[PDB]
Amino acid sequence: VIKPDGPATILAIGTSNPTNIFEQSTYPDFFFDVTNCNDKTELKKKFQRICDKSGIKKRHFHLTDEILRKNPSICKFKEASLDPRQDIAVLEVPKLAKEAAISAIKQWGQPKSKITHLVFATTSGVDMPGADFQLAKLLGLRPTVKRVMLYQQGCYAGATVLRVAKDLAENNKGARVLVACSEVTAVTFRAPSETHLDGLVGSALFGDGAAALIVGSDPVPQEEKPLFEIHWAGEAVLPDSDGAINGHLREAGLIFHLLKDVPGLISKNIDKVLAEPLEYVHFPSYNDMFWAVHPGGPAILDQIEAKLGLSTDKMQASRDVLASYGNMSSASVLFVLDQIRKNSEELHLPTTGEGFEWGFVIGFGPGLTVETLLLRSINI
Amino acid sequence: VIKPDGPATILAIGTSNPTNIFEQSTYPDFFFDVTNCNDKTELKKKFQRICDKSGIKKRHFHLTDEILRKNPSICKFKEASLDPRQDIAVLEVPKLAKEAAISAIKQWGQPKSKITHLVFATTSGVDMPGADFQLAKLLGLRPTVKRVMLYQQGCYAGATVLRVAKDLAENNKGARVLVACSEVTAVTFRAPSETHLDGLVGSALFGDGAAALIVGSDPVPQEEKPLFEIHWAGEAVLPDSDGAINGHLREAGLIFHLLKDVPGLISKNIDKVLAEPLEYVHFPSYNDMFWAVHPGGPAILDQIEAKLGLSTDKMQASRDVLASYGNMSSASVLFVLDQIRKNSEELHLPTTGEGFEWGFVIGFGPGLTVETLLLRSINI
């Protein structure tokens, strides 16, 4: 049996977002109006403060005033609303992923018939057949495409899809893995409550977006263009972090609870979590590495930057994604990777990883799980 | 980078089922009583006929008269019931998997600290953190265990977990993958309706059970005992099978729709689906191979047996699992593999695959997806 020689390499990255742009400055106006909470003036001030300090300037949403008017239960706090949320999510998640995938396949330059595997991640609703099948059907991929459907894995899933793609690409000769992460806030949309600050945080942070990439070992010369190589992939459940990030799919939709200690748990343990991939490459300086950190919120980015003593430019691509699209869960870290390579191509930098050799793709989520991948950039 | 030489090998299989045994002969009596449908005498006759022809003699269930009495919404056809179903499923799925895993780890003989990966599959509810985290926590596995959580993949998931474990085991030196499939009928439990024959089929077929296995490449001599080797893994979406098996997680729980043509779609295409792994091993006779076919129902087993011209003993292990535990979705095919090796050890057969060299692990489900793995038995 002939196995491929080289590491799993990202051969293309494509991204998509819904066309409806919602400015964060005036998001509280829209939000309190569609949920019929205009009379909750005090809660609006608190939500305005969360939005102004969220580090987000705009978010793209499938959900509009019209769609929410046609599905009134989604605007209610605890009323039975899973059904219309699913109806929206099940259809929109693979549709958004399709646009990201088309862009990824186009950048790759090779026909879609060469895609042997498909890894799909979403926390935006669940269905049987999954969003993986639905994406495969929409793109017209081979009926024999090997699929890995990652449902409800939260914000670390952008890192999980690459960890899965790593083994699928490296263990199968000629394997070209289509990776797709798509998030639509249909299930998480929560009406504002005086008794649910986590709901206000999520309503201020969560955005819509899809990211797709082609991963494969042994790139074909003068045909495929290598962007990033995956050298190590793994994860870690943080000590004393039980129940830090919980998410439950209920009759009212996806109800989440984030304990106040989440950014602190991440920052106190980040150096230890990065221990194994750092020793693999002989402990390079943190400032000599590129950072594709999941923009969960401004606090997570600020605290990792401060704990590891990173210069302000390291977290810029992560902050730029947060500013432009908010927290798009699984898709976010892949948008960051795309922005890192785009900045590199725009500025004519030595490597695709902003001039740096080694780098990290870090995702965070339920567990508290921190998923990390060590990537090597490609010289340009 | 040193990669392992040999194929992904199943090093142990452990199984579990809830302690409450429900005889299929008298299941209609219990079923119509707990759902308060005793007055639907005509529907009871139809359900009795489905149960008598289901090829199932007994099923193990977590759900009892008492649990259903304490959660009355689960006994209602379309009333909001996802919440109490999830409350039960989220807790019971990893608990049942724990017992299967403990049995698998015990048979393996090596410490649980050596488990580097965890692949978990369930269609019995969804939660964040997933059943994979919950199993890892209950077993006390390393906090750095690499997890692949396969939610809502239906009845082909027993084959999917092995396909995933194949690449994880073969691409990482020293990797020992704990595979766990656990199904608890909490979400699928459906009150009988004159207008939902699919509900009656599922109520007569679906059972509870968990199966766990240790998968790893390059077995350590005189320490680990190889049971089955995985040589090929793949899948196929069947032609003209759109919407054949649909499953939706709604406010009322997991609502499924199975088109009457499901066993026919599987049997008409099975020879073509098996084409790629058969040519890999030079087309051996179907009767010279062992069969670990998912016992979805008696019709699926009968029709594949008749189409491929299999002798009656081939589907026996599959029929025995159906008879003893019913359709336990993802776990079923792994129970079949366990029964194949148990029969082989009991009868002192030449190989672990009932004296045969090559064999198939076939799963079916939403798509219509047919997942197939080619296995080689080990000489005993």
TrEMBL record, chains A, B:
<feature type="domain" description="Chalcone/stilbene synthase C-terminal">
    <location>
        <begin position="229"/>
        <end position="378"/>
    </location>
</feature>
<dbReference type="InterPro" id="IPR011141">
    <property type="entry name" value="Polyketide_synthase_type-III"/>
</dbReference>
<dbReference type="Pfam" id="PF00195">
    <property type="entry name" value="Chal_sti_synt_N"/>
</dbReference>
<feature type="binding site">
    <location>
        <position position="296"/>
    </location>
    <ligand>
        <name>CoA</name>
    </ligand>
</feature>
<feature type="binding site">
    <location>
        <position position="299"/>
    </location>
    <ligand>
        <name>CoA</name>
    </ligand>
</feature>
<protein>
    <submittedName>
        <fullName>Chalcone synthase-like polyketide synthase</fullName>
    </submittedName>
</protein>
<feature type="binding site">
    <location>
        <position position="49"/>
    </location>
    <ligand>
        <name>CoA</name>
    </ligand>
</feature>
<comment type="similarity">
    <text>Belongs to the thiolase-like superfamily. Chalcone/stilbene synthases family.</text>
</comment>
<dbReference type="InterPro" id="IPR016039">
    <property type="entry name" value="Thiolase-like"/>
</dbReference>
<dbReference type="GO" id="GO:0030639">
    <property type="term" value="P:polyketide biosynthetic process"/>
</dbReference>
<dbReference type="InterPro" id="IPR001099">
    <property type="entry name" value="Chalcone/stilbene_synt_N"/>
</dbReference>
<feature type="active site" description="Acyl-thioester intermediate">
    <location>
        <position position="155"/>
    </location>
</feature>
<dbReference type="GO" id="GO:0016747">
    <property type="term" value="F:acyltransferase activity, transferring groups other than amino-acyl groups"/>
</dbReference>
<feature type="binding site">
    <location>
        <position position="258"/>
    </location>
    <ligand>
        <name>CoA</name>
    </ligand>
</feature>
<feature type="binding site">
    <location>
        <position position="155"/>
    </location>
    <ligand>
        <name>CoA</name>
    </ligand>
</feature>
<dbReference type="InterPro" id="IPR018088">
    <property type="entry name" value="Chalcone/stilbene_synthase_AS"/>
</dbReference>
<dbReference type="InterPro" id="IPR012328">
    <property type="entry name" value="Chalcone/stilbene_synt_C"/>
</dbReference>
<keyword id="KW-0808">Transferase</keyword>
<feature type="domain" description="Chalcone/stilbene synthase N-terminal">
    <location>
        <begin position="4"/>
        <end position="219"/>
    </location>
</feature>
<dbReference type="Pfam" id="PF02797">
    <property type="entry name" value="Chal_sti_synt_C"/>
</dbReference>
<keyword id="KW-0012">Acyltransferase</keyword>
<feature type="modified residue" description="Cysteine sulfinic acid (-SO2H)">
    <location>
        <position position="155"/>
    </location>
</feature>
